[PDB]
């Protein structure tokens, strides 16, 4: 029998750890879930269903229900694109678009771009963890409280917009090298902004955010460590690649993407590899010395890609190579992608060129729009 899951979402407070992901993996591999006699008594199984994008839970005795029955494949988007509010628009206006590029890669690799700037608040993939993280807080943290994090630009914007829609104040901290939209847009949205001209990176700022959290008592939402980041991308981003691959009739052989917190590419890899362990994850390694906004190298410390049972292959990509790929996608597709998006296309093109990849459909996650990076675009033109 089916029950609406939204009545059981307190498992999102109480379940801790990654062991519930074993249930997620098995449900996704088999395409079905067993009925719970007493759903309340199995909170890891319930959380596993939520995280894979179920909206209904299987209830009763000895029965089972398919992904489809459980709502993994429900259509959420109103056909006419009318929404009663911004947050409802965020939530129901999904999937983000999956668009086949006209670029051809060697060796039968066909490229589809998932365009994460189709998110209403930060015009980036960061809307998703910001909504999941603030929503998780909202039953436990008093309205009017301050929330804060370190950000490279996007999450700070997403966080400021969402905190404010939920009745919180926000503070964002940025390194000096962050884009200007990141330093300015959060103030437009009512947040306080602290810029550290000395910080050589975003994670460099975390000790300072933690120390101020202890003194001032704000909630440090820590997108680098908060499992709600990875979980947002499981029930959103990753579920979408899966359902979009099926309904689109793609022959999905892999996904490609970049790594900041590692939240969205861990979810994409974990979720798809649960369905078919041979699906590749091709991930960008910014070349040493280079700065590609929003992303960084794996050995600088990333939670989910490291702790989860995920296969992937790395590819080094210089800033200059990322920007060359921005230029090529622009002139092929009329789509203006961000540097991190250019880096991921480049990473996939490299793996294609080396003969490493099967022919088929590959999905590249494009974190944001290139309109936000005019002076990198200028440098790339020369
Ligand atoms: C956050 C971000 C990324 C990387 O997503 P992570 O999920 O946090 O692994 C890539 N590019 C840009 C522009 C981003 O803001």
């Amino acid at each position: 029998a089916l029950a609406d899951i939204s009545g059981y979402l307190d498992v999102l407070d109480s379940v801790r750890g990654f062991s519930y992901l074993e249930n997620a993996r098995e449900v996704l591999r088999s395409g079905e879930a067993r009925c719970l006699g007493n759903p309340r008594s199995e909170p890891e199984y319930v959380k596993a269903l939520y995280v894979i994008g179920a909206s209904r839970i299987p209830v009763g005795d000895g029965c089972s229900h398919t992904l489809e029955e459980l709502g993994v494949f429900d259509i959420s988007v109103p056909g006419e694109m009318v929404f009663p509010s911004p947050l409802d628009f965020f939530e129901r206006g999904k999937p983000t678009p999956l668009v086949r590029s006209r670029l051809q890669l060697p060796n039968g690799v066909r490229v589809w771009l998932k365009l994460e700037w189709y998110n209403p608040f930060s015009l980036s993939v960061k809307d998703r963890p910001a909504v999941e993280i603030i929503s998780r807080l909202s039953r436990r943290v008093e309205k009017g409280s301050l929330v804060a994090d370190a950000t490279s630009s996007n999450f700070g914007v997403a966080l400021s917009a969402v905190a404010r829609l939920y009745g919180y104040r926000a503070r964002v901290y940025l390194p000096g090298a962050a884009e200007e939209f990141g330093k300015l847009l959060p103030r437009l949205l009512g947040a306080q902004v602290i810029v550290d001209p000395e910080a050589p990176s975003t994670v460099h700022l975390l000790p300072r955010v933690m120390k101020d959290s202890k003194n001032e008592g704000f909630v440090h939402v820590n997108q680098f460590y908060n499992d709600a980041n990875f979980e947002a991308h499981m029930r959103g981003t990753a579920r979408e690649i899966f359902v979009q691959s099926r309904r689109g009739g793609l022959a999905l052989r892999g996904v490609a993407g970049s790594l900041g917190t590692s939240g969205h590419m861990s979810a994409a890899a974990f979720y798809l590899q649960s369905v078919d362990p041979s699906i590749r994850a091709v991930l960008v390694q910014p070349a040493q010395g280079d700065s590609i906004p929003g992303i960084r190298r794996v050995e600088t410390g990333m939670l989910w890609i490291n702790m989860l049972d995920i296969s992937y292959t790395l590819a080094e990509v210089t800033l200059e190579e990322a920007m060359e790929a921005v230029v090529e996608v622009a002139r092929s597709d009329g789509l203006v992608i961000g540097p991190s998006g250019g880096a991921a296309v480049k990473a996939l093109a490299k793996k294609a060129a080396e003969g490493d990849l099967e022919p088929g459909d590959y999905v590249v996650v494009v974190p944001d729009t290139g309109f936000k990076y005019l002076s990198l675009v200028q440098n790339a033109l020369e």
Side-chain angles (χ1 to χ4, degrees), residues 294-355:
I295 59 155
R296 65 204 172 100
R297 294 174 69 88
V298 182
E299 80 271 2
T300 67
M302 299 181 164
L303 180 64
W304 311 274
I305 14 123
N306 286 319
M307 292 201 48
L308 266 27
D309 216 298
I310 279 163
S311 329
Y312 56 93
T313 321
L314 297 171
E316 308 262 312
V317 175
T318 69
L319 177 54
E320 152 192 310
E321 295 172 328
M323 300 309 306
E324 286 166 353
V326 173
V327 175
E328 296 220 286
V329 171
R331 298 177 174 180
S332 166
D333 301 333
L335 299 168
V336 176
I337 75 193
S340 59
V345 166
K346 185 66 231 239
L348 177 73
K350 277 173 186 262
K351 296 293 173 184
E354 301 163 26

Side-chain angles (χ1 to χ4, degrees), residues 125-126 152 154 233 258-264 293-295 340 367-368 373:
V125 73
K126 302 303 213 300
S152 64
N154 280 324
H233 285 307
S258 62
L259 297 173
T261 72
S262 82
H264 73 277
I295 59 155
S340 59
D368 74 356
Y373 308 89

Side-chain angles (χ1 to χ4, degrees), residues 111-298:
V111 167
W112 301 64
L113 301 182
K114 186 157 175 69
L115 309 178
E116 290 296 311
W117 76 78
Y118 275 78
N119 278 297
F121 309 119
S122 66
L123 273 54
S124 89
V125 73
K126 302 303 213 300
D127 277 20
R128 306 173 182 269
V131 163
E132 196 77 23
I133 281 171
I134 291 305
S135 159
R136 213 61 73 89
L137 253 16
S138 70
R139 54 260 222 159
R140 196 162 156 117
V141 172
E142 213 192 321
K143 226 90 145 192
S145 300
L146 185 50
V147 306
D149 204 350
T151 173
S152 64
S153 275
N154 280 324
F155 182 70
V157 181
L159 182 79
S160 309
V162 178
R164 192 179 171 95
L165 289 152
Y166 271 80
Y168 300 108
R169 286 167 172 114
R171 173 185 291 175
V172 304
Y173 290 71
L174 297 101
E179 269 72 36
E180 306 303 303
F181 74 91
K183 306 176 160 153
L184 184 51
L185 290 179
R187 308 213 267 119
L188 168 67
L189 300 150
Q192 307 156 19
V193 170
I194 304 289
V195 165
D196 188 335
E198 258 48 59
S201 75
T202 306
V203 298
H204 191 260
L205 301 156
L206 289 162
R208 163 139 189 236
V209 184
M210 296 173 193
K211 180 191 144 139
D212 291 357
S213 190
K214 294 293 251 173
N215 290 316
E216 299 186 58
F218 60 69
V219 180
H220 173 207
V221 294
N222 199 359
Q223 71 170 313
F224 293 93
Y225 212 69
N226 184 328
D227 292 333
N229 169 354
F230 169 76
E231 302 166 10
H233 285 307
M234 285 290 294
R235 68 172 203 100
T237 317
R239 180 197 75 73
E240 286 166 28
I241 297 180
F242 169 55
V243 166
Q244 289 176 304
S245 288
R246 294 297 218 244
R247 294 223 161 102
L250 274 65
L252 187 66
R253 296 285 69 238
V255 302
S258 62
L259 297 173
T261 72
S262 82
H264 73 277
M265 293 309 302
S266 315
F270 183 89
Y271 187 122
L272 287 163
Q273 298 172 357
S274 306
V275 172
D276 172 5
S278 62
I279 294 173
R280 310 289 300 279
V282 176
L283 286 10
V284 176
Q285 262 280 79
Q288 248 153 341
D290 276 354
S291 282
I292 304 167
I295 59 155
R296 65 204 172 100
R297 294 174 69 88
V298 182

Side-chain angles (χ1 to χ4, degrees), residues 13-67:
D13 304 303
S14 55
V15 174
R16 282 177 293 279
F18 297 139
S19 81
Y20 80 94
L21 285 170
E22 293 170 48
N23 305 132
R25 179 148 273 175
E26 182 51 32
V27 169
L28 250 14
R29 196 195 60 74
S30 61
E32 68 171 29
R34 57 183 163 90
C35 280
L36 315 165
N38 185 359
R40 279 326 215 124
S41 89
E42 293 222 59
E44 297 204 340
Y45 209 82
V46 170
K47 194 201 181 153
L49 295 176
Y50 174 77
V51 169
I52 70 169
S55 62
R56 296 182 285 283
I57 53 159
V59 151
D61 222 86
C63 48
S64 67
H65 287 294
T66 63
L67 301 191

